[PDB]
Design a protein around this ligand. Structure first.
Ligand code: POV
Ligand code: POV
Ligand code: POV
Ligand code: POV
Ligand code: POV
Ligand code: POV
Ligand code: POV
Ligand code: POV
Ligand code: POV
Ligand code: POV
Ligand code: POV
Ligand code: DU0
Ligand code: ZY8
Lengths: 1097, 123, 168
């Protein structure tokens, strides 16, 4: 079977053929007209029964008694005399002729289908989404008129209610009733425009025009949609999307649908509107020009439990306008206090021809409907209440259903409508039980509903008291919003093992992720012993700065719109942007370094650059507002961010525009110069004063008035010397001059013959490297406070520190061999322990020349070239691998052809690489190419096949010398162009690193540094740019920062609103409105001139 | 050549990636010295005893329904992008301001018919 | 997932078949490099036999890759497979090797020197040239890397389109 529609559903047929409601008919043909015009109660003439038994009722006699007593005439029903059977009509309508020939699923099923089977059909089979609202549109079932204004004024609003909520609209489907005008709303306003409306039409099958076409197993039945526009015929409206055509086994009688529609309303209102939201899907009724029975249908709702609100429209002067009339007459309680019944009874009969009797009984219904005037709503178009029927239909669920303030709020959340919640829920009158707004906040955060989170904070929600450890863990562990797949894998990486299957994320584990992502020596609060001794136990279970914690949450969960919102709220705004940049940057790197090929890394990199640019633009706001306070923002210790600074965080992210900003550079210049105040020509004034100490007194020094602000800060003769030598610019040149003297000596040592005992030059060289090594050990341990393992990893992340480490270790291996070698020989090169040591020195000196590139990179021009070279060498690997394969592809055949008598030796390795490598540089070995030529320098190599090798070398050089070298050059040219474009930015970032480096160094260079060591560690036993603010100036700085955040958004909005695109569009929208306003003059000007022609007489 | 290929470098490798993933998906589990066993063992199992999804006609129909929905969403977004563009907004504004200039002259014409008719009823 | 299905899962994974073919190919080249650089005797060394076995079975593999390719006419199957560069190169590499082996192996030694016999020398020299094909086929393995691959495509496009400059 494997077919749920066919297997489950049911079609009835009338098995039973009583005459047409009495004696068959007169007309002398008698038995003959019994074929022509004699039907059943079934609604079908004799040949339209067509049942297997009804055809045995076409041959001899019918299925009854001889004369068929009359309590069998009444005995026909659609319960006992109709046979259920699998269905026939279902598929997709093709409304051929209607505007792209719309499509709409359809099905023929009995009135007695169980309500759950219906729900299975709508949601499972048809793949419909469970809605967040159900609008049931009742109205007049007979072709009626509708004024042009109200037409386009209804179809703007009912559509928005079903489009802003995903509401199922419900109709009869057939165009004879209100469904025709629901279609008008759909045609105009381009009903969905990629934003589906589901409007089901539940109609009876026995009335459908062209019943036949739809018959067929899963058939695409087409359907004429252009019959006479006046002739009222039960023709399905071509703009609906779904049809449930209710069968009662009959033809030509309505009323089989009344239950199944209502049963569907019950069935949906007993479904959860959302996973967390514990309400039922709301239902509401809408009334467009109702007939008589529509009145009772209102009451039929107002009583039932739970009730159903009823929004009654106006216009057209029937049940719709009528209920609008009396709804203004009856009092607040619900009983007309005046004596004005015969006047409204008069009005009933002007709309419903009764005369007196049904008129009152029709009035008797309504006085009960006017009891429950809280579940009734009138949207009158004239004086324009509610501003919209959208909000009216929606607001009707909020008033009159005695719903808690919470239930009112959370339903707007499901719908994602703040405009209704702001205006209609948050208002004087609501009472708001103890923890309802907070539970609302949790739902809004979890569901990524930023607009409500905004609203809740404004309307009285404290994030300080809201945000707890349990609620924060519930936010990390949810799956009901935008998630980050990576986060689970980052937790699995920092938790070295695996996890039980239903592992719920812990904040300690988040803390370990944040430390991984921030790196260096960052330590999160969550990993600290205080928080642990709290957390293991679980005023203290709250957080002092919740908006810091939720920013981290939103970024780790890849919830960027929420992260941008939580950034602009709270304190520490520049830090939060810089932390966010680093977090996303590191996640981007993890994605890039994974084996997955996707767009996650470029997405996360973009998010990092978004917050990075916010931090730069905030720094420029602050700098233009107040330079001194801008510099304080760069330097204040961030207690909440591992005691770091915003400058250090920006450096951790390779955020060069922030570091290159003038404010940062001004800060760095003051550190570099110290108390020195030369504006020009400082390099040689410092050099000559290192070498001529009395020239120190001729230099310009800052006054204490100047050395007072310096927002990173921590004249007699003696203090001028102190000021000079403790200045980092001086420590640079003093270290530089000593380093150059070091190299000149060590160069002398390796070039000059080495004796038994080191020369005085060599001793000085040894002393330098030894004390330079002690310095490097101390730079690691007196580095940024952290774990020793973290300190180690950071310091070995620089190139020149790895090189210096190898340089230092190799030197003392070399010195040990050079110095501890016993001389069995007078020659001193017969001893090969000694020679090994000397050769290490000769290679070790390379490290020390290459370390001069780091000194030279202190210059603004040289520095970017040094970074170029590093990037060239670091990224050329794969081109060189290809070059090596090309080399061997030539080297191996050359050796094999030219030297065919070789036994295995390691000389084979040399010979296959050696000459081919030197060819890269243009050495062709001209007189070795053709070994059989007269001018050959290898005549003994002449032999069989040796004529091949010139052809091989011809190809090799073309590929190697021309193609491959110039590919490598092309790669290097791109590096040049990339770095040159950002050259000034590159040096300004380098400038941070060397100013910080020499700020922390001691005042003596590495030969004499030992005294600075030996004197300092006494003062600790015997007895960098970080501003330590008090809590009062800390609060002023936060106030400064929030002002500049406000000014940032203001300028952003002003720039946006001044842009030409924004001016074209507002003009566009505004000219459109005016074109109606002028037609509204062009319309009213008639009413003037024609009324003047009326008063002309 | 370098500049042309470098501009599309990630695209180039991702296309290459199709070719080698397909190549090694079809290869046997042993490399060419020992592949002979994979040969000698496989052709026995045929005598003695790539990325293609074989759908049933029912899921085939669901996929076509999925596809046509996404074709509709493609044209909708295309139309919305077009209609939001500044050029399309200048021109509709252009055409619409033109109409209004007649509609105002249609007020400026009819306002006469009012004031002059009022001067007629003034007597 | 039991023990036996983890081995099945591993070895049938295409990433594994890549590295397992790559490690065997590198070992192949290292041996064949040894064979051509070291003096060649009457009978193939054990290294040379392994080299022969690789190319023979690699050839059977290529024949089967063509016939168990995408379903079609044999003429269409052939045209498709000879549309790749490395398949044309491997075809020449395989045919030339067994021309070289036949001469190297079926040469009667009238001489003790072994380079006086010029059928033998012809075979050895073919090996020394044939090994170039097998180094250049490493570019295809290396193009599996994200950085190296585009450079390999660059080189091919350089060589393919430089003809008329070289004619000048
Ligand atoms: C034994 C001698 C041969 C090997 C050479 C050894 C020497 C050193 C050179 C090595 C060059 C190869 C480097 C790549 C392989 C390492 C891992 C790697 O990255 O694999 C990649 C594929 O790897 C391949 O496709 C390699 C194929 C083998 C090439 C063998 C010949 C190369 C040498 C030619 C002969 C001349 C030179 C040598 C002198 C004879 C996949 O990497 P991944 O991790 O999936 O991707 C990283 C990116 N991610 C983070 C986004 C995922
Ligand atoms: C922008 C740029 C700014 C400017 C930058 C400027 C940089 C300024 C840098 C400046 C200093 C440069 C000097 C270093 C090289 C000296 C070598 C030399 O000439 O040796 C000769 C001089 O005699 C001696 O050297 C004897 C003294 C031994 C100890 C060396 C100390 C030298 C002074 C350094 C104090 C420590 C400094 C370092 C501390 C770490 C000895 O050779 P000889 O006599 O010919 O040999 C005899 C041969 N015989 C055996 C055959 C007879
Ligand atoms: C974060 C920090 C970054 C920087 C790294 C910092 C750490 C840097 C660490 C550096 C040390 C690296 C290891 C060196 C090992 C020496 C090996 C050697 O040559 O052994 C030889 C000498 O061995 C001896 O013991 C005699 C030589 C005197 C000792 C000189 C080296 C130690 C000083 C180190 C000062 C380091 C200062 C560190 C200060 C902090 C043994 O062989 P032989 O005796 O020659 O054999 C003679 C045979 N024959 C007689 C037959 C001929
Ligand atoms: C990203 C990169 C990832 C890493 C990639 C790593 C790639 C891994 C690849 C790895 C394998 C590398 C080895 C191959 C080269 C060996 C040559 C050699 O050293 O020979 C020597 C060793 O002795 C022998 O070779 C004797 C054994 C003969 C058969 C060869 C099997 C060798 C192993 C291969 C197994 C098959 C493998 C291939 C299957 C197709 C013999 O020389 P000799 O003794 O000096 O000569 C005597 C001279 N005399 C006559 C003067 C006395
Ligand atoms: C789509 C697929 C893509 C790949 C292509 C796949 C197909 C690849 C096809 C490859 C075959 C190419 C042709 C080779 C012909 C050999 C020529 C030769 O050297 O002849 C010589 C040896 O001739 C002999 O018959 C003796 C040598 C033994 C046979 C070895 C080669 C055949 C194996 C092939 C295995 C191929 C495996 C293929 C498996 C599929 C004749 O001369 P001589 O005897 O040396 O003369 C001696 C004279 N003297 C005595 C005076 C000194
Ligand atoms: C005397 C004769 C005997 C000796 C002969 C020896 C032969 C020659 C041997 C060596 C040559 C010296 C260079 C070695 C490699 C450099 C590392 C590197 O790329 O760093 C770079 C990246 O990578 C890292 O920072 C981490 C990688 C290295 C691991 C840490 C070292 C571990 C021990 C050793 C193992 C590693 C390999 C070395 C082991 C041999 C750092 O770049 P950077 O500068 O940070 O750029 C930004 C600068 N900024 C922050 C200011 C903006
Ligand atoms: C990380 C630290 C690792 C290293 C720690 C230190 C380990 C200890 C290291 C060395 C100790 C060596 C002591 C002697 C050993 C026994 C042999 C012997 O005595 O004599 C032999 C020494 O032959 C040599 O080769 C000696 C030099 C070896 C060093 C090789 C480089 C390693 C250091 C590179 C830098 C690495 C650093 C990289 C930086 C990261 C021969 O000399 P002879 O006997 O006098 O002469 C006899 C011949 N004659 C008869 C012709 C005269
Ligand atoms: C005795 C002979 C004379 C001496 C030689 C002359 C002295 C040597 C000269 C220069 C040495 C290097 C200068 C360093 C400049 C600073 C760089 C830095 O800070 O970090 C850089 C690393 O930098 C490196 O990795 C440096 C190079 C490694 C050592 C190899 C040296 C060359 C030898 C091999 C060549 C031979 C091959 C052929 C062999 C046959 C970091 O840059 P990056 O990672 O690219 O940045 C990416 C940024 N991103 C995050 C946005 C992606
Ligand atoms: C041992 C010593 C003795 C031997 C020494 C002999 C000397 C050396 C001899 C030869 C060097 C080897 C290369 C030969 C030519 C390459 C063809 C080519 O350009 O292909 C390219 C285009 O073109 C084609 O694909 C069709 C052109 C070739 C025709 C088919 C081969 C017919 C037989 C042979 C006649 C042809 C000429 C060769 C006949 C000699 C294919 O490019 P691709 O890779 O598909 O690029 C896209 C890849 N992708 C789909 C994955 C994205
Ligand atoms: C597509 C397949 C086509 C080829 C199929 C195979 C065809 C068959 C091929 C070869 C058969 C050769 C048998 C011998 C012929 C008679 C001569 C003779 O016996 O001796 C002579 C051999 O002289 C030579 O040159 C022998 C080598 C010829 C091969 C040339 C390269 C072609 C293959 C390239 C690759 C192409 C593959 C391209 C890939 C697409 C001399 O030697 P001798 O007599 O011992 O010494 C006398 C001199 N003495 C007195 C000084 C000692
Ligand atoms: C013994 C010596 C050492 C060995 C040498 C080193 C090893 C050799 C190195 C590299 C070999 C080639 C690498 C192939 C990379 C893949 C390319 C591919 O897939 O197809 C490419 C073809 O590719 C070719 O045609 C390849 C080259 C043909 C053989 C000539 C080799 C060089 C010698 C001659 C030079 C000497 C001249 C001077 C002579 C005196 C297809 O690319 P395309 O068609 O351009 O694409 C256009 C796309 N379009 C459709 C948009 C238009
Ligand atoms: C992918 C690339 C393919 C090419 C290649 O790299 C990888 O493959 C490697 C194989 C290597 C050889 C293996 C074995 C030996 C034997 C040894 O013999 C002892 C010495 C003797 C002294 O007398 C004892 O007494 C000498 C060295 C030699 C011939 C190797 C040379 C280098 C070779 C050819 C390498 C070559 C560059
Ligand atoms: O570019 C800068 C522009 C203007 C200023 C600076 C800049 O950088 C600084 C820097 O750098 C120098 C290098 C050599 C000699 C003198 C200086 C100085 C001077 C200075 O100290 C200074 C003014 N104010 C303090 C003063 C109270 C305002 C702080 C910032 C400062």
């Amino acid at each position: 079977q494997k077919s749920w529609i066919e297997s489950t559903l049911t079609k009835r047929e009338c098995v039973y053929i009583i005459p047409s409601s009495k004696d068959p008919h007169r007309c002398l043909p008698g038995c003959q007209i019994c074929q022509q015009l004699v039907r059943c109660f079934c609604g079908r003439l004799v040949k339209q029964h067509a049942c297997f038994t009804a055809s045995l009722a076409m041959k001899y006699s019918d299925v009854k008694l001889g004369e068929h007593f009359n309590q069998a005439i009444e005995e026909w029903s659609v319960e006992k005399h109709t046979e259920q059977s699998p269905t026939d009509a279902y598929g997709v309508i093709n409304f051929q002729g209607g505007s792209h020939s719309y499509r709409a699923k359809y099905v023929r099923l009995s009135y007695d289908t169980k309500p759950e089977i219906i729900l299975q059909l709508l949601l499972k089979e048809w793949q419909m989404e469970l809605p967040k609202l159900v609008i049931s549109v009742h109205g007049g079932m007979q072709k009626f008129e509708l004024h042009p204004r109200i037409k386009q004024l209804l179809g703007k609003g009912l559509i928005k209610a079903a489009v802003t909520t995903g509401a199922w609209i419900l109709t009869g489907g057939v165009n004879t009733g209100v469904a025709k005008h629901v279609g008008d709303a759909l045609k105009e306003h381009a009903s969905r425009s990629s934003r589906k409306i589901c409007t089901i039409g539940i109609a009876p099958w026995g009335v459908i025009e062209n019943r036949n076409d739809l018959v067929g197993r899963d058939v695409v039945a087409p359907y004429q949609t252009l019959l006479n526009p006046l002739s009222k015929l039960n023709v399905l409206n071509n703009l609906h999307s779904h049809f449930i055509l209710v069968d009662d086994g009959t033809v030509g009688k309505y009323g089989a649908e009344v239950r199944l529609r209502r049963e569907l309303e019950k069935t949906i209102n007993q479904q959860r509107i959302h996973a967390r939201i514990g309400q039922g899907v709301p239902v509401v009724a809408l009334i467009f020009e109702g007939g008589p029975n529509v009145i009772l249908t209102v009451l039929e709702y107002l009583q039932e439990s739970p009730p159903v609100p009823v929004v009654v429209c106006e216009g057209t002067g029937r049940a719709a306008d009528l209920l609008a009339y009396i709804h203004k007459q009856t009092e607040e309680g619900g009983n007309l206090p005046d004596a004005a019944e015969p006047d409204i009874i008069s009005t009933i009969k002007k709309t419903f021809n009764f005369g007196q009797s049904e008129a009152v009984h029709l009035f008797q219904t309504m006085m009960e409907c006017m009891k429950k005037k809280e579940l009734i709503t009138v949207f009158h178009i004239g004086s324009e209440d509610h501003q919209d029927i959208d909000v009216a239909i929606l607001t009707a669920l909020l008033k009159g259903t005695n719903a808690s303030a919470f239930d009112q709020l959370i339903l707007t959340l499901a719908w994602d409508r703040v405009d209704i919640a702001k205006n209609h829920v948050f208002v004087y009158g609501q009472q708001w039980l103890v923890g309802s707004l907070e539970q609302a906040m949790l739902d809004a955060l979890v569901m990524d509903r930023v607009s409500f989170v905004k609203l809740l904070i404004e309307n009285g929600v404290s994030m300080h008291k809201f945000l707890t450890i349990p609620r924060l863990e519930e936010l990390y562990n949810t799956k009901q919003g935008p998630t980050n797949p990576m986060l689970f894998h980052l937790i699995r990486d920092v938790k070295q093992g695996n996890l039980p299957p239903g592992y719920k994320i812990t904040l300690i584990d988040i803390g370990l992720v944040i430390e991984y992502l921030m790196g260096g020596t960052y330590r999160c609060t969550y990993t600290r012993k205080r928080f642990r001794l709290i957390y293991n136990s679980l005023e203290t279970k709250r957080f002092p700065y919740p908006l810091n914690e939720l920013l981290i949450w939103a970024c780790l969960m890849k919830r960027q719109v929420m992260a941008r919102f939580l950034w602009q709220h709270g304190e520490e705004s520049m830090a939060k942007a810089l932390v966010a940049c680093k977090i996303y940057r590191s996640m981007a790197y993890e994605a890039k370094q994974s084996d997955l090929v996707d767009d996650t890394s470029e997405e996360l990199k973009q998010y990092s650059n978004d917050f990075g640019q916010l931090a730069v633009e905030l720094l420029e706001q602050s700098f233009r507002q107040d330079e001194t306070m801008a510099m304080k923002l760069l330097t204040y210790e961030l207690k909440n961010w591992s005691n770091s600074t915003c400058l250090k965080l920006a450096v951790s992210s390779r955020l060069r525009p922030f570091v290159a900003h003038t404010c940062t550079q001004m800060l760095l210049s003051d550190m570099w110069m110290g108390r020195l105040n030369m504006r020009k020509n400082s390099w040689y004034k410092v050099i000559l004063s290192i070498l001529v100490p009395p020239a120190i007194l001729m230099l310009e020094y800052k006054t204490k008035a100047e050395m007072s602000h310096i927002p990173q800060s921590q004249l007699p003769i003696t203090r001028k010397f102190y000021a000079f030598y403790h200045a980092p610019i001086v420590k640079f040149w003093f270290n530089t001059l000593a380093y150059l003297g070091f190299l000149m000596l060590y160069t002398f040592v390796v070039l000059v013959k080495m004796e038994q005992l080191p020369s005085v030059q060599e001793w000085i060289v040894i002393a330098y490297i030894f004390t330079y090594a002690i310095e490097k050990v101390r730079e690691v341990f007196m580095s940024e406070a952290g774990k020793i393992s973290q300190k180690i990893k950071v310091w070995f992340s620089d190139y020149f520190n790895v090189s210096d480490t190898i340089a230092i270790i190799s030197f003392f291996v070399g010195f040990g061999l050079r110095f501890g070698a016993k001389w069995n020989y007078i020659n001193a090169y017969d001893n090969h322990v000694f020679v090994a040591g000397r050769l290490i020195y000769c290679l070790n000196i390379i490290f020390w020349y290459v370390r001069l590139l780091d000194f030279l990179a202190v210059n603004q021009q040289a520095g970017p070239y040094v970074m170029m070279i590093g990037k060239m060498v670091a990224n050329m690997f794969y081109i060189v691998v290809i070059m090596a394969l090309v080399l061997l592809s030539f080297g191996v055949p050359r050796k094999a052809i030219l030297y065919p008598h070789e036994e295995p030796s390691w000389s084979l390795a040399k010979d296959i690489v050696f000459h081919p490598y030197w060819m890269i540089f243009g050495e062709v070995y001209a007189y070795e190419i053709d070994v059989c030529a007269n001018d050959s320098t290898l005549p003994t190599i002449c032999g069989p096949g040796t004529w091949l090798t010139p052809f091989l070398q011809a190809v090799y050089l073309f590929v190697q010398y021309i193609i491959m070298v110039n590919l490598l050059i092309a790669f290097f040219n791109n590096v040049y162009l990339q770095v040159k474009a950002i050259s000034n930015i590159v040096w300004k970032y380098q400038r941070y690193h060397f100013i910080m480096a020499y700020h922390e160094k001691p005042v003596l260079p590495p030969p004499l540094i030992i005294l600075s060591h030996i004197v300092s560690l006494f003062c600790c036993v015997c007895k960098g740019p970080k501003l330590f603010l008090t809590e009062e100036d800390q609060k002023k700085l936060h106030d400064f920062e929030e002002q500049c955040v406000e000014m940032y958004f203001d300028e952003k909005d002003d720039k946006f609103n001044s842009g030409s695109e924004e001016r074209i569009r507002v003009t566009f929208e505004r000219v459109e409105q005016m074109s109606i306003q002028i037609k509204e003059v062009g319309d009213r000007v008639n009413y003037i001139k024609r009324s003047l022609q009326s008063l002309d007489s």
